[PDB]
Design a protein around this ligand. Structure first.
Ligand code: FAD
Ligand code: FAD
Ligand code: PAP
Ligand code: PAP
Lengths: 539, 538
């Protein structure tokens, strides 16, 4: 009869609106501790740079139109501070008031809160901010004066890069600090290397493998673990989030992985008539069928819509997620879906990988740009665990396609069968996504064996020899161009193991096939020189 | 062994190169009656306009590099004229020579040929051309002179529109003539209307539902059945293609639908050691499991690679196709996959449809443009039969996604579960593809009932009343209550009346439908709403 929703953004409002469409007469109350509901908080970084000109553009729907269209009782500046699940009352702080509201059903969608980093002097710092809501933006925009020159972003995740990009676009000298060994920890190191290059190309300093230990001089100085210092006029904390579970814990709502709220197949908690959705809940990673946290807007919107279906008596299941993310870094796009190689192995999965470098559309049609794709799959069954993409254009499309293939339980053997919208302006007859399947098939079926960039030095140190098959146009390397290899194939030593490489793995794979059938042990360098020079520029 | 391949483009060369990678020692011979192999014939329309500047950009791989890289014996200007499946010899004409070549395996990839319509004066016409290869292009370049002003394209399919767009960019007065009732026959009428609007916006005259009766005055005049005449300095015939099967028929190779070559699960014909791939073979439409011709480059490339796997002893199956097509019409993109509503019904399928009007990315991020998506699905199981898209941006992505959903046999119940690359510049948290699944679930589950544009008049004639819920800022016998006032003014309606709700988009009229349904009032939603209705039935 009476449904109260805690949280008035992605999860909460999606439930509230769907609830109204399913139950015209139900009383639906939305509690939002902040000043606005349905604010496009995902667009906040682009307002800092000016790409979103007016702040009103970020208020999706006003509270006046929400009551008119859906007759919702929305209550900003209402912070819920306690839940009694047995009496079914919540306690709310509103300005100076302490209010008590009874509920019949309760939907928890409080989202996530910023990780409080373990940095000394944070309380005395005056130029350190997070950017997750309008109150945060208000503080950040008041600090961005003409005298502000240097900014530092701590945390190089997808959101951390959007902050750094848009701060650079404001004319600031930006430095990016990541604890992990590379930017975009969600990506694998060799794919993240293309992003670091784009940041350096645009005068964004990157500091990896080093954490922030202290804020000195009221935040004007940031101390790193090595003792290196950074000057900062404005510091943005984007070091990840943790579920906002303090209220749930105090109410006896059970939590699990990383403090997320545990829910069953119908989004229900361990408490009677209390459901949960959004960033605050533990979801099922469908690739592993194990618990995970996937703090993204698309799942949150779906979960809110589906918990409304549940409460309204429809049979709807909480099925889980795989996770699909994307960020634009100046003239480059980086996206991923599912599990990276590192995460796949960390989950106990048996993995193989292949790297493909293509174009977003036919090369003979002008404007074609390079694409880098990676696939992580099972080396016998062909089950797909994840994919990563780097490129100026066409990356969102390829990763969206591969996300859909994972949802459909398609294996590498099915990727060549997919039919895409091919015309010279839009793609290639054999799309890069088709090629991932062809290349992956050759590895499973034994027609190709590849070597990874992180294996090359050790393989060469053990006695392998690098065969460079580039056209005349490494040191201890034999150089026979592909066009001459079939005739000069007798110069090679048949008792030697070779690792074939070109600029792209296509021409080296053709050579590998020649050598294999001539009785010469040969492997393909996955990604070839183009990838190796990017991630291991020194070796 | 020795493998001979007839046809040296998409299917044939894809087979030849894959065979070489699998069998270094095999003799591979490619016969091509034309002057080049591996020519990017799909780009020929864009060379006409100059968007592809130099013709060499269209020769993918030169003849020298093919023998250097793959040690292939490629033979252009070699037309095969007979096949003896028992002797295992083919007869080839090369200039003045008649040659005999023996084979162990034979791959047929002769492709398709233009359907020549029965228009009078075709042989005496001097300004009429097809554009399917370089020899065709050589003839067309003689007609693209400084004195050429008016051009006519007969046939408004996907390729026909590419011809019209690129001819217009050449500065010519272009007219398009289609026998069918609307441009892009593959699309449904209400979706094709967006394409005709873009054509007219760019000064391309469109004549639909009429055929060409005669080419008069050596082609400078084209007369239409209505008696109307068209002046033309250059006429392109793009009225579809038919399988090039003359060689197969003469050799005892069985043929099927529309003359296509019949092949089994391993691309093999009824003759021993003769295989076939490409536009020339009958494929299985996977949505219906029925025979079909899907003359597209992506299937042809896949088929050629897989018949090589077969001939080399690998386990590979000929699984079929669904068909995915796209065309750019100036500032618009039109794409489709699977079966249109019309084609689904013609195949005997039980169909329902839903139309979604969205944006390619978040509206609060600048540059967002409109997207029109249509879904054709089964109204009980949710099986997806096809989808169509219209828009300046994001259409290729959405239709590729939905094509992938069909391949994985995802239903409308799975579309809301898909997770896409959402960031303000690239999409929406609830993507238009997600939204298709939500709206389709409401129909299957009975929470919404919709009325199609072609049903409206009959429903209103039977007693239903149109409820217009647009904000007052036009239909005839329509009750007008804006959505923002409907909840309070809900008592003005007649509860013994059936209402059909409409707005500019189906989202707000669906919300209103939900109000009425729960107030005990029979209500349905107009699918596509006023925006789509005004486009197809002005
Ligand atoms: C700057 C930024 C950029 C992002 N960009 C992207 C992107 O490009 N793509 C993407 O997919 N995701 C992105 N996200 C993540 C996305 O915003 C979240 O995954 C999504 O909002 C989660 O929805 P939710 O309802 O669980 O939580 P939220 O959207 O965080 O909402 C929770 C709400 O509950 C309120 N609340 C909490 N506790 C209480 C209480 N006790 N009483 C009352 N109200 C309470 C909070 O104030 C808040 O309004 C971004 C997030 C941020 C901050
Ligand atoms: C202008 C144009 C635009 C197109 N645009 C698109 C598009 O945007 N997207 C898309 O997916 N597809 C497009 N296509 C279709 C695509 O080209 C075909 O689907 C594909 O090429 C089919 O490959 P194939 O090998 O079966 O036949 P083809 O590519 O036609 O090649 C067959 C070859 O065999 C040769 N041959 C035939 N008979 C003999 C014989 N007896 N002896 C010797 N040689 C012989 C022919 O000369 C020809 O070179 C387009 C085609 C054209 C012409
Ligand atoms: N980076 C890469 N690493 C390994 N193999 C690759 C790579 N890029 C392309 N290939 C392979 O190289 C081939 C590229 O196919 P194309 O059709 O583009 O070229 P082709 O005309 O020479 O056949 C495919 O081989 P396959 O048919 O034997 O599977 C594809 O799998
Ligand atoms: N063209 C359309 N025709 C019918 N229904 C539509 C259309 N576009 C959107 N909708 C529906 O309208 C709703 C759109 O939801 P949004 O998330 O965009 O906005 P909201 O905040 O009002 O929920 C969905 O309703 P549902 O959750 O009950 O399914 C969606 O199904």
């Amino acid at each position: 009869g009476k449904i109260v929703i805690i949280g008035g953004v992605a999860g909460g409002m999606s439930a509230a609106t769907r609830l109204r469409r399913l139950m015209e007469d139900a009383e639906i109350v939305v509690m939002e501790k902040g000043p606005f509901v349905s604010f496009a908080n995902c667009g906040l970084p682009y307002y800092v740079s000016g790409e979103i000109a007016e702040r009103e553009q970020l208020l999706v729907q006003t509270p006046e139109a929400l009551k008119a269209r859906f007759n919702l009782d929305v209550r900003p500046h209402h912070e819920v501070v306690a839940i009694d699940p047995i009496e079914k009352v919540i306690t709310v702080k509103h300005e100076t008031e302490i209010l008590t509201e009874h509920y019949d059903k309760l939907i928890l969608s409080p989202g996530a809160k910023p990780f409080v980093p373990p940095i000394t002097g944070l309380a005395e710092a005056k130029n350190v901010f997070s950017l997750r809501n309008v109150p945060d933006l208000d503080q950040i925009m008041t600090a961005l004066t003409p005298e502000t020159k240097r900014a530092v972003v701590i945390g190089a995740g997808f959101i951390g890069l959007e902050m750094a990009e848009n701060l650079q676009k404001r004319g600031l000298e930006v430095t990016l600090v990541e604890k992990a060994p590379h930017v975009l920890p969600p990506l694998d190191e060799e794919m993240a290397a293309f992003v670091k290059a784009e940041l350096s190309k645009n005068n964004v300093q990157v500091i990896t493998g080093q954490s922030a230990v202290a804020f000195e001089e009221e935040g004007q100085v940031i101390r790193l673990e090595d003792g290196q210092t950074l000057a900062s006029d404005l510091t943005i904390l984007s070091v990840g989030v943790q579920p906002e579970n303090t209220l749930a814990v105090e109410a006896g709502v059970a939590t699990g992985l990383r403090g997320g709220i545990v829910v069953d197949e119908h989004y229900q908690t361990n408490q009677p008539d209390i459901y949960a959705v959004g960033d605050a809940i533990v979801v099922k990673q469908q690739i592993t069928q194990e618990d995970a946290l996937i703090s993204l807007a698309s799942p949150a919107n779906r979960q809110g819509r589906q918990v409304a279906d549940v409460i309204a008596g429809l049979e709807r299941k909480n099925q889980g997620s795989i996770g699909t993310a994307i960020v634009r870094v100046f003239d480059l796009t980086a996206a991923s879906t599912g599990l990276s190689e590192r995460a796949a192995k960390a989950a106990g999965l048996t993995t193989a990988v292949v790297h493909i470098s293509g174009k977003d559309h036919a090369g003979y049609y002008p404007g074609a740009t390079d694409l880098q794709l990676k696939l992580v799959f099972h080396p016998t069954t062909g089950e797909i665990y994840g994919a990563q993409g780097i490129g100026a254009k066409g990356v969102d499309k390829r990763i969206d396609i591969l996300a859909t293939a994972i949802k459909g339980q398609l294996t590498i053997f099915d990727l060549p069968e997919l039919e895409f919208t091919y015309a010279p302006p839009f793609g290639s007859a054999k799309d890069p996504v088709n090629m991932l399947g062809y290349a992956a098939m050759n590895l499973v079926e034994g027609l190709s064996e590849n070597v990874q960039w992180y294996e090359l030095s050790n393989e060469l140190a053990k006695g392998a020899v690098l065969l460079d098959v580039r056209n005349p146009a490494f040191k201890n390397a034999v150089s026979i161009p592909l066009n001459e290899l079939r005739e000069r194939l007798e110069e090679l030593d048949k008792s030697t193991e070779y690792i074939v490489s070109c600029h792209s793995g296509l021409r080296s794979y053709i050579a590998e096939r020649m050598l294999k059938q001539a009785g010469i042990s040969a492997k393909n360098l996955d990604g070839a020189f183009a990838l190796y020079r990017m991630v291991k520029p020194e070796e």
